[PDB]
Design a protein around this nucleic acid. Structure first.
Ligand SMILES: Nc1ncnc2c1ncn2[C@@H]1O[C@H](CSCC[C@H](N)C(=O)O)[C@@H](O)[C@H]1O
Ligand SMILES: [Zn+2]
Ligand SMILES: [Zn+2]
Ligand SMILES: [Zn+2]
Ligand SMILES: [Zn+2]
Length: 472
DNA sequence: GGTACTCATCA
DNA sequence: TGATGAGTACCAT
């Protein structure tokens, strides 16, 4: 129902198509992903819209031009100016068409001038796509240039999105929707390359979140023992307790099996050598239904959720680099444990996390549920659970949300007993720096009874729009 | 139907 | 570094 959720699910569907095209090794799988979205009538906003799109807030970060196409936010994958064609002329009979609704500024036009709240934006045309990429002939008042002129004359604002470079390993560039701007005036003049260009002076409208630019409270330098490949610092700027999240608690990197929990028969595994790449020859690809569930992109991303993923294991002939061991690899991201206002400790990332990336296995002591307060994860892909109450990895610090950005994935690798699957958290969405990582704990309402005559209730503080207000 | 256009993306 | 990329937008040589 709710538009932010619609946007989320559209973007997840695009990400699925994208990764499937990457697996098929198709040219420009981003664009192919869009074509698949069009075929499936899955473009969220299939017609042009003036102003804001519901579910797309000012500040929204897009991870490719293609994503913007998938949502319907900006319909060309290349073109800087998106406008209503003459098809829209009866719908908007009092405006003069064409009429622009969205522009992208990515530093490609030498005449562009970016001063944040004020922008001088170059029209389209005569722009070289090959070479030093300069203007190579005069522009005229046509196409997008006309569209922008009409915006100026009819007081129709345009959405403005900026491309930004990232020094991250996995995402090279991001596009931020920076809000509505009015087209104040336009004119022709000689550009820096000596040919005529049209220029559009844009001024950011008020009534919007401010444009923004861009270790305090450290309580522990690395909550792992140096056991994670990337250290995980902890902070507390909520109060000044000097207490670390590690007090009382022993960080571990591998599961601990309680003595009365059975150790199932080891998986037979595959006979591939080095890395598994041929899905015909690989028994582990066969277990998954014939294809690998992970794609070899950004050190391994899960294409889509499954009842269970079958990874290579102890007896496979392949080494640790195998893409079908994706969730077994080193922590890829710089993370931080921080004190939340009302949920206790919480986890966020300092880096971008691509959708489908593994975040972590839930590590703790595996116990029979019959033998077992707030750090237990039942394995239900329930006879067995993972207890991180006294020992575990960082997973136990991740909070619940009614609108999460991580999801739970069961993985079999050491053995084939589904009751004892590994529990692994993957990014459901593309996650930006400093966003809290969360998953849905999945408790039923009124499942919990206090030791007396009361249903026991626990308030949710996830802050989501559709919060429902109770963990249970 | 025919096609000129184009502010990305790939190590 | 540049070759490709595909959904138009508009005319229908
Ligand atoms: N969305 C949410 N709202 C309120 N409390 C939450 C919450 N998500 C997690 N919690 C709290 O965190 C517990 C899960 S363990 C998660 C780590 C915990 N926040 C800590 O400080 O160690 C829950 O029992 C609950 O007390
Ligand atoms: Zn393998
Ligand atoms: Zn194999
Ligand atoms: Zn294998
Ligand atoms: Zn909630």
């Amino acid at each position: 129902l709710e538009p932010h959720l619609k946007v989320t699910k559209c973007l997840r569907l695009f990400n699925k198509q994208y990764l499937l095209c990457v697996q098929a090794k198709l040219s420009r799988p981003d664009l192919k992903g869009v074509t698949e979205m069009i075929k499936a009538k899955a473009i969220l906003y299939p017609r042009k819209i003036i102003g804001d799109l519901p579910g797309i807030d000012v500040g929204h970060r897009f991870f490719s031009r293609a994503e913007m196409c998938a949502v319907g936010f900006h319909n060309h994958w290349l073109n800087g100016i998106d406008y209503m064609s003459m098809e829209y002329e009866k719908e908007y009979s009092n405006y003069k068409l064409p009429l622009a609704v969205s522009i992208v500024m990515s530093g490609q036009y030498e005449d562009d001038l970016d001063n944040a709240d004020t922008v001088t934006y170059t029209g389209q045309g005569g722009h070289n796509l090959t070479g030093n990429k300069r203007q190579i002939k005069d522009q005229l008042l046509e196409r997008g240039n006309l569209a922008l002129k009409h915006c100026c004359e009819y007081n129709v604002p345009v959405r403005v999105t900026r491309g930004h470079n990232c020094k991250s390993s996995y995402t090279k560039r991001v596009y931020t929707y920076d809000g509505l701007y009015k087209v104040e005036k336009f004119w022709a003049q000689k550009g820096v390359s000596g040919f005529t260009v049209y220029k559009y002076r844009l001024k950011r409208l008020e009534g919007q979140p401010e444009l923004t630019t861009d270790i305090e409270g450290l309580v522990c330098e690395d909550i792992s023992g140096g056991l994670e490949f990337k250290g995980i610092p902890a902070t507390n700027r909520v109060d000044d307790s000097p207490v670390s999240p590690t007090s009382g608690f022993t960080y571990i990197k591998s599961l601990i099996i309680e003595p009365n929990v059975i150790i199932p028969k080891s998986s037979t595994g595959c006979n591939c050598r080095g890395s598994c790449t041929d899905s015909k020859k690989c028994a582990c690809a066969k277990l998954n239904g014939g294809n690998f569930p992970y794609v070899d992109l950004n050190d391994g991303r899960l294409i889509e959720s499954r009842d269970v993923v079958f990874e290579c294991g102890p007896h496979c002939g392949c080494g640790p680099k195998c893409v079908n061991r994706t969730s077994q690899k080193r922590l890829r991201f710089n993370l931080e444990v921080f004190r939340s206002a009302k949920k206790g400790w919480a986890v966020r990332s300092w880096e971008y996390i691509p959708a489908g990336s593994p975040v972590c296995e839930y590590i703790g002591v595996v116990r029979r549920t019959a033998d077992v307060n707030e750090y237990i994860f039942e394995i239900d892909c329930p006879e067995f659970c993972i207890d991180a109450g006294s020992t575990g990895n960082f997973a136990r610090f991740i909070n619940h949300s009614c609108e999460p950005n991580l999801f739970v994935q069961c993985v079999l690798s050491s053995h084939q007993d589904i009751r004892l699957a590994r529990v692994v958290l993957f990014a459901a969405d593309n996650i930006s720096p400093m966003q809290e990582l969360t998953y849905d704990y999945g408790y039923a309402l009124d499942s919990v009874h206090g030791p007396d005559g009361k249903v026991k209730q626990l308030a949710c503080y996830c802050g989501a729009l559709n919060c429902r207000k109770r963990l249970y």
